Scaffold this motif. Structure first.
Motif, mmCIF file in Angstrom:
data_model
loop_
_atom_site.group_PDB
_atom_site.id
_atom_site.type_symbol
_atom_site.label_atom_id
_atom_site.label_comp_id
_atom_site.label_asym_id
_atom_site.label_seq_id
_atom_site.Cartn_x
_atom_site.Cartn_y
_atom_site.Cartn_z
ATOM 1 N N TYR A 1 0.808 -1.212 0.000
ATOM 2 C CA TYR A 1 0.000 0.000 0.000
ATOM 3 C C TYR A 1 0.844 1.267 0.000
ATOM 4 N N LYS A 2 1.795 1.349 0.929
ATOM 5 C CA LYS A 2 2.677 2.510 1.031
ATOM 6 C C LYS A 2 3.426 2.803 -0.280
ATOM 7 N N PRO A 3 3.969 1.768 -0.954
ATOM 8 C CA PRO A 3 4.541 2.096 -2.266
ATOM 9 C C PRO A 3 3.462 2.491 -3.269
ATOM 10 N N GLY A 4 2.394 1.703 -3.318
ATOM 11 C CA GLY A 4 1.319 1.915 -4.269
ATOM 12 C C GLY A 4 0.638 3.265 -4.160
ATOM 13 N N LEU A 5 0.406 3.720 -2.934
ATOM 14 C CA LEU A 5 -0.283 4.987 -2.738
ATOM 15 C C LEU A 5 0.651 6.151 -3.047
ATOM 16 N N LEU A 6 1.929 5.998 -2.708
ATOM 17 C CA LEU A 6 2.924 7.020 -3.015
ATOM 18 C C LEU A 6 2.957 7.293 -4.511
ATOM 19 N N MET A 7 2.977 6.222 -5.293
ATOM 20 C CA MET A 7 2.981 6.339 -6.740
ATOM 21 C C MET A 7 1.676 6.935 -7.257
ATOM 22 N N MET A 8 0.569 6.270 -6.938
ATOM 23 C CA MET A 8 -0.731 6.569 -7.531
ATOM 24 C C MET A 8 -1.351 7.884 -7.086
ATOM 25 N N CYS A 9 -0.963 8.366 -5.913
ATOM 26 C CA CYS A 9 -1.629 9.527 -5.347
ATOM 27 C C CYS A 9 -0.748 10.770 -5.318
ATOM 28 N N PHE A 10 0.557 10.598 -5.501
ATOM 29 C CA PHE A 10 1.473 11.726 -5.364
ATOM 30 C C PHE A 10 2.453 11.863 -6.527
ATOM 31 N N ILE A 11 3.335 10.882 -6.686
ATOM 32 C CA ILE A 11 4.381 10.960 -7.702
ATOM 33 C C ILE A 11 3.780 11.009 -9.109
ATOM 34 N N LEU A 12 3.037 9.969 -9.476
ATOM 35 C CA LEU A 12 2.461 9.859 -10.815
ATOM 36 C C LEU A 12 1.533 11.024 -11.207
ATOM 37 N N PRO A 13 0.618 11.445 -10.311
ATOM 38 C CA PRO A 13 -0.257 12.539 -10.748
ATOM 39 C C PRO A 13 0.439 13.905 -10.817
ATOM 40 N N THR A 14 1.672 13.995 -10.326
ATOM 41 C CA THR A 14 2.441 15.234 -10.404
ATOM 42 C C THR A 14 3.314 15.259 -11.646
ATOM 43 N N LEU A 15 3.844 14.100 -12.004
ATOM 44 C CA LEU A 15 4.796 14.026 -13.097
ATOM 45 C C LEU A 15 4.142 14.291 -14.446
ATOM 46 N N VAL A 16 3.029 13.618 -14.718
ATOM 47 C CA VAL A 16 2.458 13.661 -16.058
ATOM 48 C C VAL A 16 1.839 15.012 -16.463
ATOM 49 N N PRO A 17 1.520 15.903 -15.505
ATOM 50 C CA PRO A 17 1.238 17.215 -16.097
ATOM 51 C C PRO A 17 2.523 17.981 -16.372
ATOM 52 N N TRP A 18 3.457 17.883 -15.433
ATOM 53 C CA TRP A 18 4.720 18.608 -15.491
ATOM 54 C C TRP A 18 5.589 18.172 -16.672
ATOM 55 N N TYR A 19 5.357 16.957 -17.162
ATOM 56 C CA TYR A 19 6.195 16.383 -18.212
ATOM 57 C C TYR A 19 5.511 16.273 -19.579
ATOM 58 N N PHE A 20 4.199 16.052 -19.602
ATOM 59 C CA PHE A 20 3.509 15.818 -20.873
ATOM 60 C C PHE A 20 3.006 17.103 -21.545
ATOM 61 N N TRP A 21 2.223 17.914 -20.835
ATOM 62 C CA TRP A 21 1.801 19.199 -21.397
ATOM 63 C C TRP A 21 2.503 20.381 -20.729
ATOM 64 N N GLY A 22 3.801 20.216 -20.476
ATOM 65 C CA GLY A 22 4.673 21.271 -19.980
ATOM 66 C C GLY A 22 4.174 22.130 -18.832
#
Ligand code: ST9
Ligand code: LMT
Ligand code: ZN
Ligand code: ZN
Length: 298
Positions: A166-187
């Motif tokens: 859970y701790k790895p999964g939630l870190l990815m799904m709720c924080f890291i991943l939803p931050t990266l893909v705006p910052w990286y895909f549509w600048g």
């Protein structure tokens, strides 16, 4: 285990509690950073708005269709693909893992509005909203909540699986991943990508569900059961993705909708019905209008 009777005994209707200060600071910091995220809304790109709203809905379905109807209540049954969707979505929503969420919720229903109720509305609004997450659980919660049959969940592999990772999964799904893909895909700027794409939407999902315990148990109307306390609230049904007809649902928890009427403001029932037509959900309990009419009796 044990408990300290100083946190159980009470002259009035509310005993003393132990403040969990790790949670108080983190919750405060999430909301302060969310208020700041509101101010960054007009700054944001268009895509990150779509990303934000989209991420909100899937997260909701992971709790609503997933954690609540499918697993907490076993209202319907879901085929393997949908199972994967909901369990991932539940991680996106970072409320406690499906096991703990259902466990607390099965006690929220059976011991509703007692001290065995994790979000007892008798304690007040603030407690039922977020306050119960800032304090130690009243002894009765695991004293009476140890009764519940959680075998259906424990036997489900997928459920216990996310419980472990859970701790790895939630870190990815709720924080890291939803931050990266705006910052990286549509600048998107990293700052807006953090305080809006994650900080803001996650806080939104939190309160939107918290209103189902807090707001929904004090405000609304009860045409199904007057004596209990959950209310039929349109806003909450609209705030949540369909779970606001709470006077109905506490009266009929096995309903695969959370309401008398399908699709009314139940975005999930619509979703679940779409999943059914695709052949991914199949054993929907729908309560006869007979029983619903037989219960104007309240
Ligand atoms: C968007 C649309 C969606 C709408 C949704 C609509 C839903 C409709 C219906 C309403 C459902 C209610 C919604 C719930 C949403 C709240 C989820 C969040 O906010 S979470 C968001 C993130 N925020 C957070 O995660 C806050 C973090 N939470 C905490 O730190 C603590 O829970 C605490 C501060 C509350 C104190 O808890 P504390 O007293 O110190 O102790 P612990 O609790 O830690 O566990 C003690 C052990 O005893 C046992 N046990 C416990 N409970 C039960 C029970 N009911 N029974 C039996 N046993 C129970 C158990 O064995 C346990 O060990 P283990 O389970 O570990 O094996
Ligand atoms: O006064 C106090 O009233 C509270 C109100 O719940 C009682 O509260 C009690 O509730 C249930 C049973 O009802 C117990 O499982 C719990 O451990 C205890 O807190 C206390 O036993 C009593 O000391
Ligand atoms: Zn309730
Ligand atoms: Zn329920």
């Amino acid at each position: 285990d044990i408990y300290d009777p100083t946190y159980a005994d009470a002259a009035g209707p509310s005993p003393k509690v132990e403040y969990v200060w790790r949670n108080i600071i983190l919750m405060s910091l999430l909301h302060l950073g969310a208020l700041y995220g509101i101010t960054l809304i007009p700054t944001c790109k268009f895509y990150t708005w779509l990303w934000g709203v989209f991420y909100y809905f899937v997260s909701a379905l992971g709790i609503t269709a997933g954690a609540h109807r499918l697993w907490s209540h076993r209202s319907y049954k879901a085929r393997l693909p949908l199972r994967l969707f909901l369990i991932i979505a539940n991680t996106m929503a970072f409320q406690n893992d499906v096991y703990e969420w259902a466990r607390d919720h099965r006690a929220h229903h059976k011991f509703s509005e007692t001290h065995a109720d994790p979000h007892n509305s008798r304690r007040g609004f603030f407690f039922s909203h977020v306050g119960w997450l800032l304090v130690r659980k009243h002894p009765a919660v695991k004293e009476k909540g140890s009764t519940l049959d959680l075998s259906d969940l424990e036997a489900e592999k997928l459920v216990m699986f996310q419980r472990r990772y859970y701790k790895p999964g939630l870190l990815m799904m709720c924080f890291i991943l939803p931050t990266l893909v705006p910052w990286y895909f549509w600048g998107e700027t990293f700052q807006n990508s953090v305080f809006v794409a994650t900080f803001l939407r996650y806080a939104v999902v939190l309160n939107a569900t918290w209103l189902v315990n807090s707001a929904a148990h004090l405000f609304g109307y009860r045409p199904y059961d007057k004596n209990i306390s959950p209310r039929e609230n349109i806003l909450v049904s609209l705030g949540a993705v369909g779970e606001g007809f709470h006077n109905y649902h506490h009266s009929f928890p096995y309903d695969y909708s959370a309401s008398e009427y399908r699709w009314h403001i139940n975005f999930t029932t619509f979703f679940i019905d779409c999943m059914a037509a695709l052949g991914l959900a199949y054993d929907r309990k729908k309560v006869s209008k007979a029983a619903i009419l037989a219960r104007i009796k309240r």
